[PDB]
Amino acid sequence: RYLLVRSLQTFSQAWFTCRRCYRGNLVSIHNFNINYRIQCSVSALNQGQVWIGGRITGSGRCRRFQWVDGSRWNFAYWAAHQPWSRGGHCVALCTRGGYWRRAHCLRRLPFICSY
Incomplete structure (x- = not known):
């Protein structure tokens, strides 16, 4: 069970919001089926x-x-093109295609919480 929060927030803010407002966590994805369902929801x-x-x-080198x-972490659907090195943690x-991209944590965006 997942839900969309339209409010624009940084990664750390969203992390918090998912836990306190919904007793859950920012969603994790383990297969194409769910990634696609989530994709449709924000299309x-x-x-x-x-x-x-x-x-x-x-x-260091080992992360x-x-x-x-x-x-x-057993699944990922990364965008073929995107700044990778230094692209964010x-x-x-x-919202288009459902691809995952690295992004800077302090940027404000909508987010998905599971519960």
Whole structure:
């Protein structure tokens, strides 16, 4: 069960909002079926992307890709073209096509909470 929050917020703000207002977490995606259903739900928004629960953590050369809801990173649907290196440590889903893109965490966007 997931829901869309139209309010524009930074990654950290959204993280908080999903937990306190809905007793959930920024959504995590584990298969094409769900990624597509989420895609359809936001296909009309005016913004080009929405925050989902993904984050790239770590320092140095060895890092990791995590979901704020603790589940495992076993699926991804990355956009073929996008600034990658230095492109950001937070993950967003595109309203068009449903592609995932790296984005700067302090940017304000709509987001998906699960519960």
